Amino acid sequence: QPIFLNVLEAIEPGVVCAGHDNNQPDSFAALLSSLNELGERQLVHVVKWAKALPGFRNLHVDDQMAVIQYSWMGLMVFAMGWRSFTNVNSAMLYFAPDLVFNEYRMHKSRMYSQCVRMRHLSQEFGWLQITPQEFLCMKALLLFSIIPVDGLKNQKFFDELRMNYIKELDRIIASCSRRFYQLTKLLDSVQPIARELHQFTFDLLIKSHMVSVDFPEMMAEIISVQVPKILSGKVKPIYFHT
C-alpha cells in the first residue's frame, strides 16, 4: 500500500538459473562450480536490485559497492531460504530451478552442516508464518547489515538509511512486540550462516585448482579481496540482539 512496498515488490529480481547439467553425476566439483556460477549470475541481479532501492543513492559511491560486496552472501541465502519455503516447503534447498539440493547433494557438496542451517532458516519462514512483505522488508535490511568496524566513507548516510529500513519493517509488522523480536532474531540468525559460508568458500577458493572447482571472475575477486576483511574481523555484521 505505501510507496515503499510498491518499490520492493517492483524491483524484486525474477528467476535465476544456475546452468547446471543435471545429467552429470553429483560430484563435489560439479555442484560447487554450478553454485559458483549461480553466485556470479545472482550477483548481477543483486547489484541492479540494490541500486534501485529507495535512498540507496544517498550513500557514497564507494559505500554503495562496499555494502553490496559484504552483504551478498546473507542476501542470497535469505532469498534462497524463501524460495525453498515457497516452492518445496523447506524440504530441499531451492538454489535455482535447475539446482535443487536434496539430502544426497547436501552431502556430496561437503557442506551438509551448512545446508542444514540453511534448511532450518527456510523452515523458520513456515514456523513464524512470514509474509511476502515481511520477507522483502527484511531482505532489504540485510543489505545494510554488515559494515567495516572503522566505519564507511559516509557513515551518517548509511545510519540514516538503515534507520529508515528498520522503521519500514516495524511498520508492515504493525503483543506484536514479540513479532519484531522474532523477525530481528531471524535476521540475526542469517549472519552466523553467512560466516560459515564465507569461511567455506574462501577455503575452497584457495584449494580450488586441486579439487577442480571453477570460480568465475567476480566471485574470485570478491572472495579474495572482500571476504577476508570479514573473516579477519575488519568488517562485521550489525546484530540486533547481543
Ligand X SMILES: C[C@]12CCC(=O)C[C@@H]1CC[C@@H]1[C@@H]2CC[C@]2(C)[C@@H](O)CC[C@@H]12
Binding site for ligand X (CB under 6 A): 32, 35-36, 38-39, 42, 73, 76-77, 80, 95, 197, 200-201, 204
Comparing every residue's Cβ against ligand X, the nearest one is 39
Nearer to ligand X, 60 or 110 (CB): 110
Contact 31, 109 (CB under 8 A): yes
Nearer to ligand X, 140 or 161 (CB): 140
Read off the C-alpha cell for 153: 566513507
Q: Is 131 annotated as a binding residue?
A: no
Helix ranges (H only) for 89-225 are 103-108, 112-127, 132-142, 155-173, 177-188, 190-206, 208-211, 217-225
* Cα 62 to Cα 81: distance, rounded to the nearest angstrom: 29
Nearer to ligand X, 152 or 197 (CB): 197
Beta carbon of residue 228, minimum distance to ligand X (angstroms, whole number): 14
Dihedral sign for Cα 132, 94, 124, 137, please.
negative
Q: Is 178 annotated as a binding residue?
A: no
Beta carbon of residue 14, minimum distance to ligand X (angstroms, whole number): 14
Beta carbon of residue 36, minimum distance to ligand X (angstroms, whole number): 5
Q: Longest C-alpha distance within the chain, in Å? A: 55
Q: Is 164 annotated as a binding residue?
A: no
**Comparing C-alpha atoms, which of 110, 78, 102 is closest to residue 200?**
110
Beta carbon of residue 159, minimum distance to ligand X (angstroms, whole number): 27
* Cα 172 to Cα 133: distance, rounded to the nearest angstrom: 7
Nearer to ligand X, 143 or 152 (CB): 143
Pairing mode, strands 93-96 and 235-237? unpaired
Beta carbon of residue 141, minimum distance to ligand X (angstroms, whole number): 18
* Cα 37 to Cα 181: distance, rounded to the nearest angstrom: 36
Nearer to ligand X, 36 or 145 (CB): 36
Annotated binding site: 36, 83, 201
Residues marked as binding for 17beta-hydroxy-5alpha-androstan-3-one?
36, 83, 201
